[PDB]
Amino acid sequence: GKLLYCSFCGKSQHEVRKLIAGPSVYICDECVDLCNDIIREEI
Amino acid sequence: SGKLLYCSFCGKSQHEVRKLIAGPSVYICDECVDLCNDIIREEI
Ligand SMILES: [Ca+2]
Ligand SMILES: [Zn+2]
Ligand SMILES: [Zn+2]
């Protein structure tokens, strides 16, 4: 019953497909997508 | 300079992982990103 936000981009759980929770942080699917580009070094 | 940065999700330092991606006062390593992929894709 509270708005949760991606710690990287700031979007809430209501703006993304999925919001993954760490111990005290969160990351959305869009940022994970971006992380893959960074790690794989590809577009 | 010289300071240890940790993945905010698993706690590993930048010397324990391949890459540590930085956000605003938050970090995530390549291993946790791999896990996130399994979570999003809902597969193993
Ligand atoms: Ca040091
Ligand atoms: Zn995000
Ligand atoms: Zn990690």
Side-chain angles (χ1 to χ4, degrees), chain A residues 1 3-43, chain B residues 1-2 4-44:
Chain A
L3 295 179
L4 299 175
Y5 306 84
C6 172
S7 305
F8 295 76
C9 74
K11 289 189 178 187
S12 77
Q13 76 266 235
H14 300 298
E15 288 177 286
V16 299
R17 305 188 182 73
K18 195 164 299 178
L19 190 63
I20 302 171
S24 314
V25 295
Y26 300 95
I27 186 169
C28 75
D29 59 290
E30 311 197 331
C31 284
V32 169
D33 192 6
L34 175 52
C35 280
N36 289 321
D37 301 335
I38 297 176
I39 294 174
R40 301 168 187 172
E41 311 183 318
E42 49 170 46
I43 294 180
Chain B
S1 298
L4 277 184
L5 303 177
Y6 301 87
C7 168
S8 303
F9 297 73
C10 73
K12 288 185 175 177
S13 68
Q14 76 273 210
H15 303 305
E16 300 176 296
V17 300
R18 293 177 179 175
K19 188 186 304 303
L20 195 63
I21 300 175
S25 299
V26 62
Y27 306 90
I28 190 169
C29 75
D30 56 293
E31 292 176 51
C32 284
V33 168
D34 288 313
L35 175 51
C36 284
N37 285 325
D38 289 343
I39 295 176
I40 297 171
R41 301 166 185 169
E42 312 190 326
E43 58 178 53
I44 294 182

Coordinates of all heavy atoms in Angstrom, one line a residue, unseen atoms left out:
Chain A
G1 N 0.8 -1.2 0.0 CA 0.0 0.0 0.0 C 0.8 1.3 0.0 O 0.5 2.2 0.7
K2 N 1.9 1.2 -0.8 CA 2.8 2.4 -0.9 C 3.5 2.4 -2.2 O 3.8 1.4 -2.8 CB 3.9 2.3 0.2 CG 4.9 3.3 0.1
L3 N 3.8 3.6 -2.7 CA 4.5 3.8 -4.0 C 5.9 3.5 -3.8 O 6.6 4.0 -2.9 CB 4.3 5.2 -4.5 CG 2.9 5.7 -4.9 CD1 3.0 7.1 -5.4 CD2 2.4 4.8 -6.0
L4 N 6.4 2.5 -4.6 CA 7.8 2.1 -4.6 C 8.5 2.6 -5.9 O 7.8 2.5 -7.0 CB 7.9 0.6 -4.5 CG 7.3 0.0 -3.3 CD1 7.3 -1.5 -3.3 CD2 8.0 0.5 -2.0
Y5 N 9.7 3.0 -5.8 CA 10.4 3.5 -7.0 C 11.7 2.8 -7.4 O 12.4 2.4 -6.5 CB 10.7 5.0 -6.9 CG 9.4 5.8 -6.6 CD1 9.0 6.0 -5.3 CD2 8.7 6.5 -7.6 CE1 7.9 6.8 -5.0 CE2 7.6 7.2 -7.4 CZ 7.2 7.4 -6.1 OH 6.0 8.1 -5.8
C6 N 12.0 2.8 -8.7 CA 13.3 2.2 -9.1 C 14.3 3.1 -8.6 O 14.2 4.4 -8.8 CB 13.3 2.1 -10.6 SG 14.9 1.7 -11.3
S7 N 15.4 2.6 -8.0 CA 16.4 3.4 -7.4 C 17.3 4.0 -8.5 O 18.0 5.0 -8.2 CB 17.3 2.6 -6.5 OG 16.5 2.0 -5.4
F8 N 17.2 3.5 -9.7 CA 18.1 4.0 -10.8 C 17.4 5.1 -11.6 O 18.0 6.1 -11.9 CB 18.5 2.9 -11.7 CG 19.5 1.9 -11.0 CD1 19.0 0.9 -10.1 CD2 20.8 1.9 -11.2 CE1 19.8 0.1 -9.4 CE2 21.7 1.0 -10.6 CZ 21.2 0.1 -9.7
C9 N 16.2 4.8 -12.1 CA 15.5 5.8 -12.9 C 14.3 6.6 -12.3 O 13.9 7.6 -12.8 CB 15.0 5.1 -14.2 SG 13.5 4.1 -13.9
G10 N 13.9 6.1 -11.1 CA 12.8 6.8 -10.4 C 11.4 6.4 -10.8 O 10.4 7.0 -10.2
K11 N 11.2 5.5 -11.7 CA 9.8 5.1 -12.1 C 9.2 4.3 -11.0 O 9.9 3.5 -10.3 CB 9.8 4.4 -13.4 CG 10.1 5.3 -14.6 CD 9.9 4.5 -15.9 CE 10.1 5.4 -17.1 NZ 9.7 4.8 -18.4
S12 N 7.9 4.4 -10.8 CA 7.2 3.6 -9.7 C 6.9 2.2 -10.3 O 7.0 1.9 -11.5 CB 6.0 4.3 -9.3 OG 4.9 4.1 -10.2
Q13 N 6.4 1.3 -9.4 CA 6.0 0.0 -9.8 C 4.8 0.0 -10.7 O 4.5 -0.9 -11.4 CB 5.7 -0.9 -8.5 CG 4.3 -0.6 -7.9 CD 4.4 0.4 -6.7 OE1 4.0 0.1 -5.6 NE2 5.0 1.6 -7.0
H14 N 4.1 1.2 -10.7 CA 3.0 1.3 -11.6 C 3.3 1.8 -13.0 O 2.4 1.9 -13.8 CB 2.0 2.3 -10.9 CG 1.5 1.8 -9.6 ND1 0.8 0.7 -9.4 CD2 1.6 2.4 -8.4 CE1 0.5 0.5 -8.1 NE2 1.0 1.5 -7.5
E15 N 4.6 2.1 -13.2 CA 5.0 2.6 -14.5 C 5.8 1.5 -15.3 O 6.1 1.7 -16.4 CB 5.9 3.8 -14.4 CG 5.1 5.1 -14.0 CD 6.1 6.2 -13.7 OE1 6.8 6.3 -12.7 OE2 6.1 7.1 -14.6
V16 N 6.2 0.5 -14.6 CA 7.1 -0.6 -15.1 C 6.4 -2.0 -15.1 O 5.5 -2.2 -14.4 CB 8.4 -0.6 -14.5 CG1 9.1 0.7 -14.6 CG2 8.3 -1.0 -13.0
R17 N 7.0 -2.9 -15.9 CA 6.5 -4.2 -15.9 C 6.8 -5.0 -14.7 O 6.1 -5.8 -14.2 CB 7.1 -5.0 -17.2 CG 6.8 -4.3 -18.5 CD 7.3 -5.1 -19.7 NE 7.1 -4.4 -20.9 CZ 7.8 -3.4 -21.4 NH1 8.8 -3.0 -20.6 NH2 7.6 -2.9 -22.5
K18 N 8.0 -4.7 -14.1 CA 8.5 -5.4 -12.9 C 9.5 -4.5 -12.1 O 10.3 -3.9 -12.7 CB 9.1 -6.7 -13.3 CG 9.2 -7.7 -12.1 CD 9.5 -9.1 -12.6 CE 8.3 -9.6 -13.4 NZ 8.5 -11.0 -13.9
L19 N 9.3 -4.5 -10.8 CA 10.2 -3.8 -9.9 C 10.8 -4.8 -9.0 O 10.2 -5.3 -8.1 CB 9.5 -2.7 -9.2 CG 10.3 -1.7 -8.4 CD1 11.2 -0.9 -9.4 CD2 9.5 -0.7 -7.6
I20 N 12.1 -5.1 -9.2 CA 12.8 -6.1 -8.4 C 13.4 -5.4 -7.2 O 14.1 -4.4 -7.3 CB 14.0 -6.7 -9.3 CG1 13.3 -7.4 -10.5 CG2 14.7 -7.7 -8.4 CD1 14.3 -7.9 -11.5
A21 N 13.2 -6.0 -6.0 CA 13.7 -5.5 -4.8 C 15.0 -6.1 -4.2 O 15.1 -7.3 -4.2 CB 12.6 -5.6 -3.7
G22 N 15.9 -5.2 -3.8 CA 17.1 -5.7 -3.2 C 16.8 -5.5 -1.7 O 15.7 -5.2 -1.3
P23 N 17.8 -5.7 -0.8 CA 17.6 -5.5 0.6 C 17.0 -4.1 1.0 O 16.0 -4.0 1.7 CB 19.0 -5.7 1.2 CG 19.6 -6.6 0.3 CD 19.2 -6.1 -1.1
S24 N 17.5 -3.1 0.3 CA 17.0 -1.7 0.6 C 17.0 -0.8 -0.7 O 17.0 0.4 -0.6 CB 18.0 -1.0 1.6 OG 18.2 -1.9 2.7
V25 N 16.9 -1.5 -1.8 CA 16.8 -0.8 -3.1 C 15.9 -1.5 -4.1 O 15.4 -2.6 -3.8 CB 18.3 -0.7 -3.7 CG1 19.1 0.2 -2.9 CG2 18.9 -2.1 -3.9
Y26 N 15.7 -0.9 -5.2 CA 14.9 -1.5 -6.3 C 15.4 -1.2 -7.7 O 16.1 -0.2 -7.9 CB 13.5 -0.9 -6.2 CG 12.7 -1.1 -4.9 CD1 12.8 -0.1 -3.9 CD2 12.0 -2.2 -4.7 CE1 12.1 -0.3 -2.7 CE2 11.3 -2.4 -3.5 CZ 11.4 -1.5 -2.5 OH 10.7 -1.7 -1.3
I27 N 15.1 -2.0 -8.6 CA 15.5 -1.8 -10.0 C 14.4 -2.3 -10.9 O 13.9 -3.4 -10.7 CB 16.8 -2.5 -10.4 CG1 17.3 -2.1 -11.8 CG2 16.7 -4.0 -10.3 CD1 18.7 -2.5 -12.2
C28 N 14.0 -1.5 -11.9 CA 12.9 -1.9 -12.8 C 13.4 -2.7 -14.0 O 14.6 -2.7 -14.3 CB 12.1 -0.7 -13.2 SG 12.9 0.3 -14.5
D29 N 12.5 -3.3 -14.7 CA 12.9 -4.1 -15.9 C 13.5 -3.2 -17.0 O 14.4 -3.7 -17.7 CB 11.6 -4.7 -16.5 CG 10.5 -3.8 -16.9 OD1 9.9 -3.2 -16.0 OD2 10.3 -3.6 -18.1
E30 N 13.2 -1.9 -17.1 CA 13.7 -1.1 -18.1 C 15.2 -0.8 -17.8 O 16.1 -0.8 -18.7 CB 13.0 0.3 -18.2 CG 11.5 0.1 -18.2 CD 10.8 1.4 -18.7 OE1 11.3 2.5 -18.5 OE2 9.7 1.3 -19.3
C31 N 15.5 -0.6 -16.5 CA 16.9 -0.4 -16.1 C 17.7 -1.7 -16.2 O 18.9 -1.6 -16.5 CB 17.0 0.2 -14.7 SG 16.5 1.9 -14.6
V32 N 17.1 -2.8 -16.0 CA 17.8 -4.1 -16.2 C 18.1 -4.2 -17.6 O 19.2 -4.6 -18.0 CB 16.9 -5.3 -15.7 CG1 17.5 -6.6 -16.1 CG2 16.7 -5.2 -14.2
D33 N 17.2 -3.8 -18.5 CA 17.4 -3.9 -19.9 C 18.6 -3.0 -20.3 O 19.4 -3.4 -21.1 CB 16.1 -3.3 -20.6 CG 16.1 -3.6 -22.1 OD1 17.0 -4.3 -22.6 OD2 15.2 -3.1 -22.8
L34 N 18.6 -1.8 -19.7 CA 19.8 -0.9 -20.0 C 21.1 -1.5 -19.4 O 22.1 -1.4 -20.1 CB 19.5 0.4 -19.3 CG 20.6 1.5 -19.3 CD1 21.1 1.7 -20.8 CD2 20.0 2.8 -18.7
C35 N 21.0 -2.2 -18.3 CA 22.2 -2.8 -17.7 C 22.7 -3.9 -18.6 O 23.9 -4.0 -18.7 CB 21.8 -3.4 -16.3 SG 21.8 -2.3 -15.0
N36 N 21.9 -4.6 -19.3 CA 22.3 -5.6 -20.3 C 23.1 -4.9 -21.4 O 24.1 -5.5 -21.8 CB 21.2 -6.4 -20.8 CG 20.5 -7.3 -19.8 OD1 21.2 -7.9 -19.0 ND2 19.2 -7.4 -19.9
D37 N 22.7 -3.8 -21.9 CA 23.4 -3.1 -22.9 C 24.8 -2.6 -22.4 O 25.8 -2.7 -23.2 CB 22.7 -1.8 -23.4 CG 21.3 -2.2 -23.9 OD1 21.1 -3.3 -24.4 OD2 20.4 -1.3 -23.9
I38 N 24.8 -2.2 -21.2 CA 26.1 -1.7 -20.6 C 27.1 -2.9 -20.4 O 28.2 -2.8 -20.8 CB 25.8 -1.1 -19.2 CG1 25.0 0.2 -19.4 CG2 27.2 -0.8 -18.5 CD1 24.6 0.8 -18.0
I39 N 26.6 -4.0 -19.9 CA 27.4 -5.2 -19.7 C 27.8 -5.8 -21.0 O 29.0 -6.2 -21.2 CB 26.7 -6.2 -18.8 CG1 26.5 -5.6 -17.4 CG2 27.5 -7.5 -18.7 CD1 25.6 -6.5 -16.5
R40 N 26.9 -6.0 -21.9 CA 27.2 -6.6 -23.2 C 27.8 -5.7 -24.2 O 28.3 -6.1 -25.2 CB 25.9 -7.2 -23.8 CG 25.2 -8.3 -22.9 CD 23.8 -8.6 -23.3 NE 23.1 -9.4 -22.4 CZ 21.8 -9.8 -22.5 NH1 21.1 -9.3 -23.5 NH2 21.3 -10.5 -21.5
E41 N 27.8 -4.4 -23.8 CA 28.4 -3.4 -24.7 C 27.8 -3.5 -26.1 O 28.5 -3.6 -27.1 CB 29.9 -3.5 -24.7 CG 30.5 -3.6 -23.3 CD 32.0 -3.7 -23.3 OE1 32.6 -4.3 -24.2 OE2 32.6 -3.0 -22.4
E42 N 26.5 -3.4 -26.2 CA 25.7 -3.5 -27.5 C 24.4 -2.7 -27.4 O 23.9 -2.4 -26.4 CB 25.4 -4.9 -27.7 CG 24.8 -5.6 -26.5 CD 24.2 -7.0 -26.9 OE1 24.9 -7.8 -27.6 OE2 23.1 -7.3 -26.5
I43 N 24.0 -2.3 -28.6 CA 22.7 -1.6 -28.8 C 21.8 -2.4 -29.6 O 22.2 -2.9 -30.7 CB 23.0 -0.2 -29.5 CG1 23.8 0.7 -28.6 CG2 21.6 0.4 -29.9 CD1 24.1 2.0 -29.3
Chain B
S1 N 38.4 8.4 -4.9 CA 39.6 7.6 -5.3 C 40.0 6.5 -4.3 O 40.1 6.8 -3.1 CB 40.8 8.6 -5.5 OG 40.6 9.6 -6.4
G2 N 40.2 5.3 -4.9 CA 40.6 4.2 -4.0 C 39.5 3.6 -3.2 O 39.7 2.6 -2.6
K3 N 38.3 4.3 -3.1 CA 37.2 3.8 -2.2 C 36.5 2.6 -2.8 O 36.4 2.4 -4.0 CB 36.2 4.9 -2.0 CG 36.8 6.0 -1.3
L4 N 36.0 1.7 -1.9 CA 35.3 0.5 -2.2 C 33.9 0.8 -2.5 O 33.2 1.5 -1.7 CB 35.4 -0.5 -1.1 CG 36.6 -1.4 -1.0 CD1 36.4 -2.4 0.1 CD2 36.8 -2.2 -2.4
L5 N 33.4 0.3 -3.7 CA 32.0 0.5 -4.0 C 31.4 -0.9 -4.0 O 32.0 -1.9 -4.3 CB 31.9 1.0 -5.5 CG 32.6 2.3 -5.8 CD1 32.5 2.7 -7.3 CD2 32.0 3.5 -4.9
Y6 N 30.1 -0.9 -3.5 CA 29.5 -2.2 -3.3 C 28.2 -2.3 -4.1 O 27.5 -1.3 -4.3 CB 29.1 -2.5 -1.9 CG 30.3 -2.6 -1.0 CD1 30.8 -1.4 -0.4 CD2 31.0 -3.8 -0.7 CE1 31.9 -1.4 0.5 CE2 32.0 -3.8 0.2 CZ 32.5 -2.7 0.8 OH 33.6 -2.7 1.7
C7 N 27.8 -3.5 -4.6 CA 26.6 -3.7 -5.3 C 25.5 -3.6 -4.2 O 25.6 -4.2 -3.1 CB 26.5 -5.1 -5.9 SG 24.9 -5.6 -6.5
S8 N 24.5 -2.7 -4.4 CA 23.5 -2.5 -3.5 C 22.5 -3.7 -3.3 O 21.8 -3.8 -2.3 CB 22.6 -1.3 -3.9 OG 23.5 -0.1 -4.0
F9 N 22.6 -4.7 -4.2 CA 21.8 -5.8 -4.1 C 22.3 -7.1 -3.5 O 21.7 -7.7 -2.7 CB 21.2 -6.2 -5.5 CG 20.4 -5.2 -6.1 CD1 20.9 -4.0 -6.6 CD2 19.0 -5.3 -6.2 CE1 20.1 -3.0 -7.1 CE2 18.2 -4.3 -6.7 CZ 18.8 -3.1 -7.2
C10 N 23.6 -7.4 -3.8 CA 24.2 -8.6 -3.1 C 25.4 -8.2 -2.2 O 25.8 -9.1 -1.4 CB 24.8 -9.5 -4.2 SG 26.2 -8.9 -5.1
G11 N 25.8 -7.0 -2.2 CA 26.9 -6.6 -1.3 C 28.3 -6.8 -1.7 O 29.3 -6.5 -1.0
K12 N 28.5 -7.4 -2.9 CA 29.9 -7.6 -3.4 C 30.5 -6.3 -3.8 O 29.9 -5.4 -4.3 CB 29.9 -8.6 -4.6 CG 29.6 -10.0 -4.2 CD 29.7 -11.0 -5.4 CE 29.5 -12.4 -4.9 NZ 29.6 -13.4 -6.1
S13 N 31.9 -6.2 -3.6 CA 32.6 -5.0 -4.0 C 32.9 -5.0 -5.5 O 32.7 -6.1 -6.1 CB 33.9 -4.8 -3.2 OG 34.8 -5.8 -3.6
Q14 N 33.4 -3.9 -6.0 CA 33.7 -3.8 -7.5 C 34.9 -4.8 -7.8 O 35.1 -5.0 -9.0 CB 34.0 -2.4 -7.9 CG 35.3 -1.8 -7.5 CD 35.4 -1.2 -6.2 OE1 36.1 -0.2 -5.9 NE2 34.5 -1.7 -5.3
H15 N 35.6 -5.2 -6.8 CA 36.7 -6.1 -7.1 C 36.3 -7.6 -7.1 O 37.1 -8.4 -7.4 CB 37.8 -5.9 -6.0 CG 38.3 -4.4 -5.9 ND1 38.8 -3.7 -7.0 CD2 38.3 -3.6 -4.9 CE1 39.1 -2.5 -6.7 NE2 38.9 -2.4 -5.4
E16 N 35.1 -7.8 -6.7 CA 34.6 -9.2 -6.6 C 33.6 -9.5 -7.8 O 33.2 -10.6 -7.9 CB 33.8 -9.4 -5.3 CG 34.6 -9.2 -4.1 CD 33.8 -9.3 -2.8 OE1 32.9 -8.5 -2.6 OE2 34.1 -10.2 -2.0
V17 N 33.4 -8.5 -8.7 CA 32.5 -8.7 -9.8 C 33.1 -8.2 -11.1 O 34.1 -7.5 -11.1 CB 31.1 -8.0 -9.6 CG1 30.5 -8.6 -8.4 CG2 31.3 -6.5 -9.5
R18 N 32.5 -8.6 -12.2 CA 33.0 -8.1 -13.5 C 32.8 -6.7 -13.8 O 33.6 -5.9 -14.2 CB 32.4 -9.0 -14.6 CG 32.8 -10.4 -14.7 CD 32.1 -11.2 -15.7 NE 32.5 -12.6 -15.8 CZ 31.9 -13.5 -16.6 NH1 31.0 -13.2 -17.4 NH2 32.4 -14.7 -16.5
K19 N 31.5 -6.2 -13.5 CA 31.1 -4.9 -13.6 C 30.1 -4.4 -12.6 O 29.3 -5.2 -12.2 CB 30.5 -4.6 -15.0 CG 30.3 -3.2 -15.4 CD 29.6 -3.0 -16.7 CE 30.3 -3.7 -17.9 NZ 31.7 -3.2 -18.0
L20 N 30.3 -3.2 -12.2 CA 29.4 -2.6 -11.2 C 28.8 -1.3 -11.9 O 29.5 -0.4 -12.1 CB 30.1 -2.2 -9.9 CG 29.3 -1.9 -8.7 CD1 28.6 -3.2 -8.3 CD2 30.2 -1.4 -7.6
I21 N 27.5 -1.4 -12.1 CA 26.8 -0.3 -12.8 C 26.3 0.7 -11.7 O 25.6 0.3 -10.8 CB 25.6 -0.8 -13.6 CG1 26.2 -1.7 -14.7 CG2 24.9 0.4 -14.3 CD1 25.1 -2.4 -15.6
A22 N 26.6 2.0 -11.9 CA 26.2 3.0 -10.9 C 24.9 3.8 -11.3 O 24.8 4.3 -12.4 CB 27.3 3.9 -10.6
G23 N 24.1 4.0 -10.3 CA 22.9 4.8 -10.5 C 23.0 5.9 -9.5 O 24.1 6.1 -8.9
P24 N 22.0 6.7 -9.2 CA 22.1 7.8 -8.2 C 22.2 7.2 -6.8 O 21.2 6.8 -6.2 CB 20.9 8.6 -8.4 CG 20.5 8.3 -9.8 CD 20.7 6.9 -9.9
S25 N 23.4 7.1 -6.2 CA 23.6 6.5 -4.9 C 23.1 5.1 -4.8 O 22.6 4.7 -3.7 CB 22.9 7.4 -3.8 OG 23.4 8.7 -3.9
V26 N 23.4 4.3 -5.8 CA 23.0 2.9 -5.8 C 23.8 2.2 -6.9 O 24.3 2.8 -7.8 CB 21.5 2.7 -6.2 CG1 21.2 3.3 -7.6 CG2 21.1 1.3 -6.1
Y27 N 24.1 0.9 -6.7 CA 24.9 0.1 -7.6 C 24.3 -1.3 -7.8 O 23.7 -1.8 -6.9 CB 26.3 0.0 -7.1 CG 27.0 1.3 -6.7 CD1 26.9 1.8 -5.4 CD2 27.7 2.0 -7.7 CE1 27.5 3.1 -5.1 CE2 28.3 3.2 -7.4 CZ 28.2 3.7 -6.1 OH 28.8 4.9 -5.8
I28 N 24.6 -1.9 -9.0 CA 24.2 -3.2 -9.2 C 25.3 -3.9 -10.1 O 25.8 -3.3 -11.0 CB 22.8 -3.3 -10.0 CG1 22.3 -4.8 -10.0 CG2 23.0 -2.7 -11.4 CD1 20.9 -4.9 -10.4
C29 N 25.7 -5.1 -9.7 CA 26.7 -5.9 -10.4 C 26.2 -6.7 -11.5 O 24.9 -7.0 -11.6 CB 27.5 -6.7 -9.5 SG 26.7 -8.2 -8.9
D30 N 27.0 -7.3 -12.4 CA 26.7 -8.1 -13.5 C 26.0 -9.4 -13.1 O 25.1 -9.9 -13.8 CB 27.9 -8.4 -14.4 CG 29.0 -9.1 -13.6 OD1 29.6 -8.4 -12.7 OD2 29.3 -10.3 -13.8
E31 N 26.4 -9.9 -11.9 CA 25.7 -11.2 -11.4 C 24.3 -10.9 -11.0 O 23.4 -11.7 -11.3 CB 26.6 -11.7 -10.2 CG 27.9 -12.2 -10.6 CD 28.8 -12.6 -9.4 OE1 28.2 -13.4 -8.6 OE2 29.9 -12.2 -9.3
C32 N 24.0 -9.8 -10.4 CA 22.7 -9.5 -10.0 C 21.8 -9.1 -11.2 O 20.6 -9.4 -11.2 CB 22.6 -8.3 -9.0 SG 23.1 -8.8 -7.3
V33 N 22.4 -8.6 -12.2 CA 21.7 -8.3 -13.4 C 21.3 -9.6 -14.1 O 20.2 -9.7 -14.6 CB 22.6 -7.5 -14.4 CG1 21.9 -7.4 -15.8 CG2 22.8 -6.0 -13.9
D34 N 22.2 -10.6 -14.0 CA 21.9 -11.9 -14.6 C 20.7 -12.5 -13.9 O 19.8 -13.1 -14.5 CB 23.1 -12.9 -14.4 CG 24.2 -12.5 -15.3 OD1 24.0 -12.3 -16.6 OD2 25.4 -12.5 -14.9
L35 N 20.6 -12.3 -12.5 CA 19.5 -12.8 -11.8 C 18.3 -12.1 -12.1 O 17.2 -12.7 -12.3 CB 19.8 -12.7 -10.3 CG 18.7 -13.0 -9.3 CD1 18.2 -14.4 -9.6 CD2 19.2 -12.9 -7.9
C36 N 18.4 -10.8 -12.3 CA 17.2 -10.0 -12.7 C 16.6 -10.5 -14.0 O 15.4 -10.5 -14.2 CB 17.6 -8.5 -12.8 SG 17.8 -7.6 -11.3
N37 N 17.5 -10.9 -14.9 CA 17.0 -11.4 -16.2 C 16.2 -12.6 -16.0 O 15.1 -12.8 -16.6 CB 18.2 -11.7 -17.1 CG 18.8 -10.4 -17.7 OD1 18.1 -9.4 -18.0 ND2 20.1 -10.4 -17.9
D38 N 16.6 -13.5 -15.1 CA 15.8 -14.7 -14.8 C 14.5 -14.4 -14.2 O 13.5 -15.0 -14.5 CB 16.6 -15.6 -13.9 CG 17.8 -16.3 -14.5 OD1 17.9 -16.3 -15.7 OD2 18.6 -16.8 -13.8
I39 N 14.5 -13.3 -13.3 CA 13.3 -12.9 -12.7 C 12.3 -12.3 -13.7 O 11.1 -12.6 -13.7 CB 13.6 -11.9 -11.6 CG1 14.4 -12.5 -10.5 CG2 12.3 -11.3 -11.0 CD1 14.8 -11.6 -9.4
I40 N 12.8 -11.5 -14.6 CA 11.9 -10.8 -15.6 C 11.4 -11.8 -16.6 O 10.3 -11.8 -17.0 CB 12.7 -9.7 -16.3 CG1 13.0 -8.6 -15.3 CG2 11.8 -9.1 -17.4 CD1 14.0 -7.5 -15.8
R41 N 12.3 -12.7 -17.1 CA 12.0 -13.7 -18.1 C 11.2 -14.9 -17.5 O 10.6 -15.7 -18.2 CB 13.2 -14.2 -18.8 CG 14.0 -13.1 -19.5 CD 15.4 -13.6 -19.9 NE 16.3 -12.5 -20.4 CZ 17.6 -12.6 -20.6 NH1 18.2 -13.7 -20.3 NH2 18.3 -11.6 -21.2
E42 N 11.3 -15.0 -16.2 CA 10.6 -16.0 -15.4 C 11.1 -17.4 -16.0 O 10.3 -18.3 -16.3 CB 9.1 -15.9 -15.6 CG 8.6 -14.5 -15.3 CD 7.1 -14.4 -15.2 OE1 6.4 -15.2 -15.9 OE2 6.6 -13.6 -14.4
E43 N 12.4 -17.6 -16.0 CA 13.0 -18.8 -16.5 C 14.3 -19.1 -15.8 O 14.9 -18.3 -15.1 CB 13.2 -18.7 -18.0 CG 14.2 -17.5 -18.4 CD 14.5 -17.5 -19.9 OE1 13.5 -17.5 -20.7 OE2 15.6 -17.4 -20.2
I44 N 14.7 -20.4 -15.9 CA 16.0 -20.8 -15.3 C 16.8 -21.4 -16.4 O 16.3 -22.2 -17.2 CB 15.7 -21.9 -14.2 CG1 15.0 -21.3 -13.1 CG2 17.1 -22.5 -13.8 CD1 14.7 -22.2 -11.9
Ligands
CA1 CA 40.5 1.6 -0.3
ZN2 ZN 14.4 1.9 -13.6
ZN3 ZN 25.3 -7.9 -7.0

